């Protein structure tokens, strides 16, 4: 009942980072403190890693196991967006704002950062555990994918949105909003596929799947807290970002057909502001 | 019996055959003479023997060319080529 409308929405949202000129951010970037620039680079690098694996591994593997040519076409399109559009856009931003050495250093930093490695290990592990014709392993990977789309990106998205909302780094911010617009529909779509599998189960099996989903969310959440503190303490925003990731965790759960898990909190209003060829006939020549 | 190697300093395959000829001289140098001629400095001999690529290996017996091998050859193939004429 939904794939065709998602197909149409995905293809009509098609974009390339080159459509957005980035030289306009040069001055507002120059004006940020060293702490702010550091957090910003690292945040986008963490996002780049997530999209790299979502494009290389997550979306293609889910596409392989989901039945139906139209469902596969949507998932293939989403995969392309992840690595050919999203992951690449971050390099466009980096190449504009930062010198090569700072770019090299931040990519080295992703490789050695323990929270980023842990979250990649956990998510990619679940993708690679999918067994052919085994719907339960597929469900588990789809939960992981929804958590990546609708929860994990958001510790990263906070900062570009926070600047966009203050009228700073608005070209980079425009790119990020386009990425976010895509991930929102990706999270909903994968969520609907996960619910299909969940709804086939006995009540006993469903109870176990909810346990899996909640245990996984909590494990990812605890790691994301440490990641958030590590990045944002130097810019004074860790508590604010934490509220934002909890907000988005609830959206991820909802995409999976589950009740919200965290209590509602006031999000920084700055971040909220950051969001024919008809031929002629003989009678057209006389009036 | 003489193994004549037509070579040049710029020829990559000719650099690869050099150690093979040194091993061949250690094993067979009592029955085989190995002669090297640089075609960059000795164009008249290369022209006389019609040698029109490098490395070119000529087996000579008593001044006459009895066998011709073009391109790189491993030691065992050069031993087989020379042993026919010993």
């Amino acid at each position: 009942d939904f794939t065709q409308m998602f197909y149409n929405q995905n293809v009509k949202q098609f974009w390339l980072p080159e459509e957005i000129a980035l030289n306009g951010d040069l001055l507002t970037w120059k004006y940020l403190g060293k702490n702010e620039q550091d957090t910003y680079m690292k945040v986008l690098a963490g996002l780049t890693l997530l999209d790299t694996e979502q494009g290389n591994t997550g979306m293609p593997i889910v596409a392989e196991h989901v039945d139906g040519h139209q469902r596969k076409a949507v998932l293939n399109f989403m995969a392309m967006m992840e690595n050919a559009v999203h992951a690449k856009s971050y390099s466009n931003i980096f190449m504009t704002l930062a010198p090569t050495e700072t770019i090299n250093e931040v990519f080295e930093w992703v490789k050695q950062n323990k929270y980023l490695q842990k979250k990649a290990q956990m998510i990619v592990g679940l993708y690679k555990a999918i067994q052919k014709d085994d719907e339960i392993s597929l469900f588990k990977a789809m939960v992981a994918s929804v958590y990546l789309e609708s929860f994990l990106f958001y510790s990263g998205f906070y900062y570009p949105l926070y600047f966009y909302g203050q009228g700073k780094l608005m070209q980079s911010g425009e790119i990020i909003n386009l990425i976010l617009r895509d991930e929102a529909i990706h999270g909903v779509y994968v969520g609907l596929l996960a619910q299909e599998i969940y709804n086939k189960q006995t009540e006993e099996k469903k109870a176990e799947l909810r346990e899996f989903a909640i245990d996984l969310l909590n494990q990812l959440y605890e790691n994301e807290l440490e990641y958030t503190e590590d990045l944002y303490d130097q810019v004074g925003l860790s508590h604010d970002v934490k509220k934002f990731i909890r907000y988005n965790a609830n959206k991820a759960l909802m995409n999976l057909g589950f009740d919200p898990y965290f209590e509602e909190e006031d999000i920084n209003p700055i971040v909220l502001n950051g969001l024919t060829v008809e031929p002629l006939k003989d009678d057209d020549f006389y009036f | 019996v003489v193994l004549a190697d037509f070579w040049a300093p710029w020829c990559g395959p000719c650099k690869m055959i050099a150690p093979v000829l040194e091993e061949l001289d250690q094993e067979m140098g009592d029955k085989l003479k190995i002669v090297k001629i640089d075609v960059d400095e000795n164009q008249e001999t290369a022209g006389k023997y019609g040698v029109m690529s490098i490395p070119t290996l000529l087996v000579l017996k008593d001044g006459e060319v009895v066998e011709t091998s073009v391109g790189f050859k491993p030691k065992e193939a050069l031993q087989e080529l020379v042993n026919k004429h010993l």
Partner: protein, 683 residues
């Protein structure tokens, strides 16, 4: 956000179901008090300001030397005696961001509105204090608006040219094409837009000195012109804009149109070169009967007949070309070409459509030349003679190239003051001064035609604003009646002022005796038809103003016959773009695109309601896209019959209307006498 911008954003914040239009005046007050009055350089007296501006190479000294300081001070007092206040924030923003003189570091503002107007008036008067005060009254009342080049650069040393347009004839030679590139760059560095007639250039596959299939067509010349205009980008502050015009019977017409296709490859596509297509009545006739048409190779016709393809009446010589075996051509489908034009205009808004026979049916100077092409704004229609630029150390044959001496009447302020005659005559005098003081040394044909033809362009703006603020719908027949009367009055007084200038100077424009003004053929419809309003409501709008009658037109015809006419061309309605904000007017005679304009400036969103917009006249300010394009064609054709040159007629199309609808609008415009069609704006 700034206080004035924040107040401007309260226009769209609706209270009690009505827009807060009164917030706009508060926006002007906040803008001035917080930005302008703080960042305008103030001097102890006007003498110190004038000395600072002339000494620092901001003003020219020659035009100020014609007046004693007492005269200049009196002129400035006259400008400030009005106590002009901008009624919308966008007007002041436009003036003090584009046209107000700023210091070399752009940090401060050197010119107020009353200062730029005073300087422009002092330039126009040329030593006359009373004339300068009259110009000051004319401009501070906002009755007449000099064009953007003239208003911006009058009396300033750091300038370009006061001429808005340059229409160049390109002859069929490599020397002529090289000179076309040179002149295009030399006129783009002056600021004015350049339009080139490429119909004389021989098509692709023609011969260069008896060797066949040698030419690459007019598309290569368009590539050269496009890169020339890109190079002369005027610092990049305003990108180099140039137009290329081609007759629809030119063989390269399909490749000429193919360059504006989005799917066109980078090896054929031109970006900075606007394109226009000149359509004689013969093409429309061929399309109407659905008979196969022929596009001709211009050089074969030139060899056979000794004359260029666009110098010959195609309605008469099309059959002669077709039955001529020595004339090369290929069969085309005129209806398919019309559909291609319609889809090209739907996709990109190009080409400009010029109905050559509509232009030349009422062209007064056909003896000098027929109008072969229009300008970049598709509203100037003047006789042009090609220049035969010969090899070096050989004398060149210099022709006539057209130039824009533009100025716009604010119909609202013109008719509120009941001064159609005075405004038209003063505007004609100012445009005459601009034409006379223009001396362009690197364009020989442009300079020669400026000296000879003495052509000026007197347009009108705020037509829709005046109609809506007076309770008249733009499509209503009363609006067309008002436009008929107003533009007949404008034409009458422009002809009268031209004849008066010819009498006072003792000279007419070159080859005036062959024009229809001298023979009296121009005044036939004016001495045979009465253009007084047919509606009592419209007739009340002209109350207190003497509407010229048939007898008055007969007296004017006799006066022109006895004394001549100084200007070959007088009236042309430009699009009137960014300067329409400063005058608080709707752009040109076109209907308004949107009731409230949503504009982005920096990190702020600015709103500009059209002037006089309110609850009572909300539906009178009907959006252009909502209008019937046929009734807009009727309105323009009613205006067009009183304008000797063309009108920048932009088509406002809905997304749902197909290419057949666009073609119907084009053919109705051709049938109604529309001379040019500027743009196809799709919403």
């Amino acid at each position: 956000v700034p206080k004035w911008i924040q107040l401007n954003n309260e226009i769209m914040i609706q209270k009690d179901g009505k827009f807060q239009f009164d917030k706009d005046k508060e926006a002007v007050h906040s803008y001035f008090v917080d930005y302008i009055n703080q960042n305008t350089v103030f001097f102890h007296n006007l003498k110190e300001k004038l000395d600072y501006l002339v000494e620092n190479q901001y003003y020219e000294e020659e035009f100020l030397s014609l007046y004693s300081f007492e005269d200049i001070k009196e002129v400035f007092k006259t400008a400030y005696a009005k106590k002009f206040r901008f009624p919308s924030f966008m007007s002041a923003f436009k003036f003090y961001n584009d046209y107000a003189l700023k210091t070399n570091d752009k940090k401060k503002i050197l010119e107020r509105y009353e200062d730029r107007i005073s300087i422009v008036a002092l330039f126009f008067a040329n030593g006359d204090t009373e004339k300068a005060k009259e110009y000051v009254n004319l401009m501070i009342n906002q009755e007449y608006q000099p064009s953007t080049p003239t208003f911006l650069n009058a009396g300033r040393k750091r300038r370009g040219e006061l001429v808005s347009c340059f229409l160049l004839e390109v002859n069929d030679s490599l020397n002529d094409i090289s000179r076309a590139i040179d002149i295009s760059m030399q006129l783009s560095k002056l600021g004015g837009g350049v339009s080139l007639n490429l119909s004389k250039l021989r098509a692709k596959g023609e011969a260069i000195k008896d060797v066949e299939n040698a030419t690459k067509g007019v598309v290569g010349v368009m590539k050269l012109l496009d890169n020339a205009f890109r190079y002369a980008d005027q610092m990049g502050q305003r990108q180099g804009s140039g137009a290329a015009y081609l007759n629809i019977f030119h063989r390269d017409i399909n490749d000429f149109l193919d360059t504006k296709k989005i799917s066109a490859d980078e090896d054929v596509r031109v970006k900075t070169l606007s394109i226009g297509v000149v359509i004689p009545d013969k093409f429309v006739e061929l399309a109407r009967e659905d008979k196969a048409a022929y596009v001709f190779y211009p050089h074969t016709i030139y060899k056979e007949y000794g004359q260029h393809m666009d110098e010959m009446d195609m309605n008469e010589m099309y059959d002669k070309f077709v039955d001529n075996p020595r004339v090369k051509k290929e069969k085309i489908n005129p209806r398919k070409l019309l559909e291609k034009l319609a889809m090209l205009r739907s996709e990109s808004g190009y080409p400009y459509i010029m109905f050559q026979d509509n232009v030349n049916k009422v062209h007064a100077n056909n003896h000098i030349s027929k109008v072969k092409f229009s300008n970049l704004c598709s509203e100037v229609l003047q006789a042009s003679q090609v220049s035969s630029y010969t090899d070096y150390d050989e004398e060149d044959e210099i022709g006539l190239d057209i130039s824009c001496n533009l100025g716009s009447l604010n119909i609202l302020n013109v008719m509120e003051h009941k001064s159609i005659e005075k405004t038209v005559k003063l505007a004609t005098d100012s445009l005459t001064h601009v034409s006379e003081t223009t001396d362009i040394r690197n364009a020989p044909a442009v300079r020669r035609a400026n000296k000879a033809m003495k052509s000026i362009g007197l347009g009108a703006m705020n037509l829709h604003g005046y109609l809506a603020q007076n309770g008249i719908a733009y499509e209503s027949p009363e609006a067309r009646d008002f436009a008929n009367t107003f533009f007949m009055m404008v034409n009458f007084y422009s002809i009268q002022r031209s004849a008066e200038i010819a009498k006072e100077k003792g000279e007419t424009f070159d080859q005036y005796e062959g024009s229809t003004y001298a023979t009296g053929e121009y005044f036939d419809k004016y001495v045979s038809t009465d253009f007084s309003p047919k509606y009592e409501k419209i007739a009340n709008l002209f109350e207190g103003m003497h509407i010229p009658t048939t007898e008055d037109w007969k007296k004017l015809k006799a006066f022109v016959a006895e004394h001549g006419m100084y200007h070959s061309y007088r009236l042309c309605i430009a699009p009137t773009g960014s300067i329409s904000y400063v005058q608080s007017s709707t752009a040109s005679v076109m209907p308004i695109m949107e009731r409230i304009e949503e504009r982005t400036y920096g990190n702020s969103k600015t709103y500009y309601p059209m002037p006089g917009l309110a609850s009572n006249n909300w539906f009178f300010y009907k959006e252009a896209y909502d209008m019937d394009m046929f009734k807009v064609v009727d309105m323009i054709a009613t205006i067009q019959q009183h304008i000797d040159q063309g009108i920048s007629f932009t088509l406002f199309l809905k997304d749902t209307m197909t290419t057949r609808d666009l073609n119907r609008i084009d053919l109705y415009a051709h049938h109604r006498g529309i001379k040019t069609i500027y743009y196809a704006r799709t919403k």
